Write a protein that binds this DNA or RNA. Sequence first.
RNA 1: GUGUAAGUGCACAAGGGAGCUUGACUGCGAGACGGACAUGUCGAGCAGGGACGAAAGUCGGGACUAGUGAUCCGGCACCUCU
RNA 2: UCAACCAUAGACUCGGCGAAAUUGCACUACGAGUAAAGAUGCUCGUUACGCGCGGCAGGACGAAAAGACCCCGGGACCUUCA
RNA 3: UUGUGCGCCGAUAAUGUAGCGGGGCUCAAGCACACCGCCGAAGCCGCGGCAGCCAACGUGUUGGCUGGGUAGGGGAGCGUCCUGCAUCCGGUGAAGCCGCCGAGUGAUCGAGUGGUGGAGGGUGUGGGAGUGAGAAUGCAGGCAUGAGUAGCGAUUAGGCAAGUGAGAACCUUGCCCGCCGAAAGACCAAGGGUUCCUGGGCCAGGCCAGUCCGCCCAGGGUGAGUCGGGACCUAAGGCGAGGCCG
RNA 4: GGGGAUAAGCUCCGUGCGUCGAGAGGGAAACAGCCCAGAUCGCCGGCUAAGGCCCCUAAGCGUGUGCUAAGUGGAAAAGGAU
RNA 5: UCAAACUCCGUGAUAGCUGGUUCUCCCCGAAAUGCAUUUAGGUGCAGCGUCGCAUGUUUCUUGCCGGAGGUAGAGCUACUGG
RNA 6: GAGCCCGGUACGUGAAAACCCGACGUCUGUCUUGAUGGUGUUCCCGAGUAGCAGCGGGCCCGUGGAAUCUGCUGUGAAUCUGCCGGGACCACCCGGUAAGCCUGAAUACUUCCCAGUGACCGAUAGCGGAUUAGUACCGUGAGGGAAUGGUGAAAAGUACCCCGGGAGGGGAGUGAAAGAGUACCUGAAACCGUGCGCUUACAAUCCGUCAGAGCCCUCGACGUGUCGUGGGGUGAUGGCGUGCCUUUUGAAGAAUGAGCCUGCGAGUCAGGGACAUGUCGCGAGGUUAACCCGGGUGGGGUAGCCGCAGCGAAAGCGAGUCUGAAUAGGGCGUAUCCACACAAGAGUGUGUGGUGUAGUGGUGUGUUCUGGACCCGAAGCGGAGUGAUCUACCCAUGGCCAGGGUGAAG
RNA 7: AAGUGUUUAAGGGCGCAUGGUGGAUGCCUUGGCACUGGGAGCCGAUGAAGGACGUAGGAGGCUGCGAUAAGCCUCGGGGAGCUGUCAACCGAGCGUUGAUCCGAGGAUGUCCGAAUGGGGAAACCCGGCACGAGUGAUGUCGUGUCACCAGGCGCUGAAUAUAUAGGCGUCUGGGGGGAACGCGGGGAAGUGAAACAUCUCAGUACCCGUAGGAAGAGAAAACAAAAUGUGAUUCCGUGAGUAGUGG
Lengths: 124, 98, 156, 63
Amino acid sequence: ARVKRALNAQKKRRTVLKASKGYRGQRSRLYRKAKEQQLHSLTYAYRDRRARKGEFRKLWISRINAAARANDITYNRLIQGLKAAGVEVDRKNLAELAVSDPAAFTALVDVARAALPEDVNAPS
Amino acid sequence: FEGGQMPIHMRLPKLKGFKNRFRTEYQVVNVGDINKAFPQGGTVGVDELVAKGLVRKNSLVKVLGDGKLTVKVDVTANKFSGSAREAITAAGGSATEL
Amino acid sequence: RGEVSGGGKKPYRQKGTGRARQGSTRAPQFTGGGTVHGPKPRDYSQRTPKKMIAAALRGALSDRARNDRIHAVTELVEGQTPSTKSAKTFLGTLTENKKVLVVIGRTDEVGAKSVRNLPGVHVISPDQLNTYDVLNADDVVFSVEALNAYISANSK
Amino acid sequence: PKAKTHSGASKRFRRTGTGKIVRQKANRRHLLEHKPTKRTRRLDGRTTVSAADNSRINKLLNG
RNA sequence: GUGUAAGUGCACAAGGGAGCUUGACUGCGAGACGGACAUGUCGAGCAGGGACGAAAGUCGGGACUAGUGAUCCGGCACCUCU
RNA sequence: UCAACCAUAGACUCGGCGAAAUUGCACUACGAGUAAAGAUGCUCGUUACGCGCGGCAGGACGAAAAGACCCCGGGACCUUCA
RNA sequence: UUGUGCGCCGAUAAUGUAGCGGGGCUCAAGCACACCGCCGAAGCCGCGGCAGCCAACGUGUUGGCUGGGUAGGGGAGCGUCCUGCAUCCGGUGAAGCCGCCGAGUGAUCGAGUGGUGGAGGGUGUGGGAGUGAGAAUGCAGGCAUGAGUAGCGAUUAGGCAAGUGAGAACCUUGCCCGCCGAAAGACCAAGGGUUCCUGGGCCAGGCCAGUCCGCCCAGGGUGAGUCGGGACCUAAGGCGAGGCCG
RNA sequence: GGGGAUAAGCUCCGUGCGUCGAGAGGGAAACAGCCCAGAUCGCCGGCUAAGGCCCCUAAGCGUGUGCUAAGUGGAAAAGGAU
RNA sequence: UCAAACUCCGUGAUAGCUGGUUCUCCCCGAAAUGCAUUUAGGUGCAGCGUCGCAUGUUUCUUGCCGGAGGUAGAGCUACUGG
RNA sequence: GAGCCCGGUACGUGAAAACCCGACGUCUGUCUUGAUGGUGUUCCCGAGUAGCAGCGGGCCCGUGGAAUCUGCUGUGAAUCUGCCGGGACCACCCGGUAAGCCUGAAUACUUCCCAGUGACCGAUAGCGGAUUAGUACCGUGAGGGAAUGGUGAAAAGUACCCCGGGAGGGGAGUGAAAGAGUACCUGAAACCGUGCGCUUACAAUCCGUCAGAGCCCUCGACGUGUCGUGGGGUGAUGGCGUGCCUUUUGAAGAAUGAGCCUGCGAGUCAGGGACAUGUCGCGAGGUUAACCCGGGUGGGGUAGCCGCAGCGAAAGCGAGUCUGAAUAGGGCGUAUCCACACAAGAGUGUGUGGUGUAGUGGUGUGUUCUGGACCCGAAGCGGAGUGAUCUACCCAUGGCCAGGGUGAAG
RNA sequence: AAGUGUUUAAGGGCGCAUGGUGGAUGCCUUGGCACUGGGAGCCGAUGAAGGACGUAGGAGGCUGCGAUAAGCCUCGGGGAGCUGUCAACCGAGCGUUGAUCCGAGGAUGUCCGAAUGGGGAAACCCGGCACGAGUGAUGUCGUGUCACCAGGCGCUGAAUAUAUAGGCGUCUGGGGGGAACGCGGGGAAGUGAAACAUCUCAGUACCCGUAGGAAGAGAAAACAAAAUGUGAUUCCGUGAGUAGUGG
């Protein structure tokens, strides 16, 4: 039985070419170049899914730092005071409060300042 | 091949001796087989052993004395060992040879 | 690569060309060249032991007999003249299944001709009985002489 | 085509009752003056083939 | 100083001397060392027949470690093989 | 020295026909670094509106010839007291 | 003076600051010693899914550990074709192809759908493979890039008027001008083979165009006692009756 | 440790030494072999390692006690130096 | 086309050499060492992987105990050499 | 997509002539001028032969102790109490009768003809050749050697009109379909356009990925635009980011290869082969080979092969055997386990009972042997032929060398 | 006055919609491949195999045929259309009084080719003899026949005497082609041995001579081993990868 290769190959070629819509130049037209770019794209996506959590945490920390310095307190002392006070709001919702409900953020800053020690540089 | 080193099949001496093209070989059967295969005894020739599947069909037969023989049996083979003869005669049987 | 026509001469310059080095025009990578590992004539028969074959036939026939798919008849039609209508009616009386196996003697020419044209009927001689034909049939209709011949051949 | 066994291996190796492959030891053809009798005694007879050479010798003998 | 390189030993001598002698044996060999394999190395003890010694005992070459060449092929002697 | 001018054939413009070597890509800068040392593509900086046309040859270790230098293996031919 | 903590000259190459990564910093953002926070990874924890090994109880649940990986070893599968058997779909539209909407842990799937199409397919369970390509300076076909770019084949040179024609730098006619003229003129041999003439044509060819042509089509055309050959003769050389040699 | 001129990003050995090879992630500006740490998948949760917290750039122009004037920090010797 | 023309055939010559070798997932997971080699870019055996079988902690780590060294250090009318 | 429409099929039938097989004859040869079993002796029984020697060939046999057979060269016998052979050779036995000739069947093969078949190919496949095929074309020659299949059920192959010189097209018709128009089934990709949406001319980009404004489209819900468990297209802007393969200690590359697409292109087959491991049958047995008979895949076929006893060079002995002077130790063997004793603590052994031992034939898979053996790739080596129309030299027979100088012998 | 602020596309990118090119895919087939069962196993000087040139009412190719030229005669079959095909377009005609078509046997059969009257660059040149035709005669035409060698038979018998060599005449053969298979001779190298010479490859490739439908071999100067044994040859399976043999 002589077997022609067309159907089996066309299947995966169509899959790869469809996945490469929107690419520039050869990378969206030719199957080989599109396949190379697909390897790179999936590697990039895998790496970026891991890095995205850190990126968003960095953005939240930036916003919380801005809103805390607006209340005359630094981010690190505010985090220490919030941990001491036992409140368990994470940085995502802390930034959400900072942007959407400034009064709530000010109240949390007040409780964090209350929970802080009297001399932060003491050998405690 | 061994990499250019003198191989194992060449650095050892050939096994001693010759083959003796005229060698006579016997198909062997022990008296224990006779006991297990002839519970009633009787005459036991070559082709009874062939029929019982104790020896090959067209070969010289020699009887040996491995087992225990407790049945009166008359055996006709080509050769006997000493212990085979004593075992067959001890049970009252005869051991005639071709 | 060696049976295809021509291609005995090395084609062109190995060097200077800037092209790939080719030793023949009939190399497998060439269009029109030979086949690398292609079909060659061969025999597929296997040396199956006799006991295995006979036991398989017995198992198939016993499976048929467990579900009473075995029938015996004296003769398929009234003798000396083939008649497909009579044989078809008789087979309909015997069974309503689709595929039947008819086992008649080699001298029963009238019955064989009578059941020859029926689409679901396969006619076999008693000494040619085999596992494939038995297992392919919903019913096995035996001739009395054929049945006795099979029993005589085996049970003896 | 039936396999052809090796002639030299057939001449140099033997099989015992339980299938053990048995060979003869070397250094016992000539130059036996300076060799003490204990050395020639330890070189006498046959030993079983070492485990490293068992596969190769079995291959050379069977085919 | 130990025949001979160097090393490890040896004065209890393994170094020096004398008397007898041929174990510079035959059949073996528990157990081991070293090792890819092939090689190589040590070995108590048993039997035969001996040397030396009153005897106990020691002797299967040399204080030890180099002085050597597998297989094939052929020569010589003996064998209750063919 | 030490070059200048003139004319034709190209080069240049218009109409017609219409190739080639080459080609992983591509909206293909520079400096100082770094790196398989030899960076348009990595780092830090500097510079730079998009697209063309005519030119020059510093780079793309430009193209070409599975080097034209050394080694390894295989050949071939030649020499002779192999 | 003695030991010490920091410092200074020594100090110094060739594209451009160039021996803090940059801006900048002694109002340290430098160093030493203590202290307090926070940032920071695919590490650990939290929540959910999967798998391998083992354990417990069961007649498949739970639990504990483990799950980077080249050469390589083992295990389980996707898709293609041909086939035994059994079933199902199809001109009320199979395959193939192009979409949409979805699906699976992967190869992949869609008896889900729309368009195109026009005759064969699917499923289960077995059997057999010319069974899967991205690369061998791989092979065949088609087509890009360079690029509407190079070149358009000598050293003589063309012009104008009229004509024909759908169309004229190139075809026809005329008048000029120029070039060869021991040739670029005339005639044979070899070679070619109808290219010769008449009429017709203008897709291919002609390095542009073409109404023209050594191009395409049809028909026609070659006349020997003396010309060149044979029927006459031999050279070198070839073949060689018998023959000699092998 | 040897060879070399204890020169080499030289060469040869030893190492229940490591890593890369065959190892992603974080740090060292970039940086196979250095430091932290071994990626089964998902999360817009948390805690930390190395390394960091003026701006680039996430987090301290943090606190206390001292030193430095050399931009030392942010490369180098013999030696010189109120 | 010539340090032995060309064509076909032996023939699918032979290359320890170069290049290539096509779907998926799950589990495990190296070596670049030793010996020998007309041997050094090859190969044979061993070392290290995997699968199956058999055997059970025999492997490993830590504590304690019993052992042999001739390195670092040191020393030298304790020897040999400078 | 037809058993009942057509050609056919099962089944019957048919030869003037030619040829081929038989048969019966004419015809020919031949025996009968014949036959038997008996008795004692001379002659004959294949000559340049057998044998021998020298040098070779070929036999499992590579000159070997080398028989049998055979070529050339020398020498060279006997006729039956003769000769040859039985693996140097001799004696004895046994077998046969060299140097004369014919001989069918069983066996090998297919240019060609007829009838069939395929878990063979289906137009880059299958023959090189489905089409002008050994053709075109290439070469002086021997020789090498292609590419090119499909409208439709029927040509019904588009009358007529219009633009155009035509080509081509638009109407109109034919057709079930002209998204079937003799550039014709289906009509993929690379490649080349046109139209619409978003974006892009201060910007250093392995061209993606993660966040993401704005714009456009779409599905739901409520009003008039405004969210949602939404979905798609494009994306200003920010973060991260050194192409694939091969070879490598190590390459994003400045080591290798690739312009692109579509087709094609590399662990296969044979053998009762070898080893291992699944699975099936039978089991101390298992199994047939050639072959014979069945229109098959079925039945028969015991010759063999492998297990069933080992040890030893062998004679041989045998649960033992070999070495050896040795019961004196060792080597190999007696499936394995268990119990009981007697010995030893030099490692455990020796016995008595039980227990009872597993092979073999198909077939799957992985390695392996011999075969081109996973595929591709030399320079070269042999055999047989083709070439001196180029060029080297030679042979025969012709031709050509403007013009002007100089001035030897005689 | 200071500040904020859309809007450009010469061209390019991406997506979508529509085309072109190209000829993949799917489905096929007057083609091949591998076999099975039969038949026939030779053709040729009575001119072969294979060709050149011609030949139909019209140009060419394939097919058929040969100056009697898609054909002639006889015997059979068959039965209504036919004048082979590419491949039609005409133009002419045949057929129930049997066409076209199929089978068997005959006739014709240019030229080349073993090629054979002589020559020759295959397919084209020039003849002798005999018998006919034609011409006033020469010219010309038609039909037979004319190679060489071998072996029979007959005649003759050189140098030369016997004689023979040779010569003359007449009969019968041969020559060449063909795919495989057969027999007898000659006989490589690449390769393997990890080099290489003995050896292997391999008595292979190739070459020479010869057949036949098959061939070769074949009727014991055989084996065998004490069996009161087999009984020409050939082929198949085992024996057996064994006994052996081998740098």
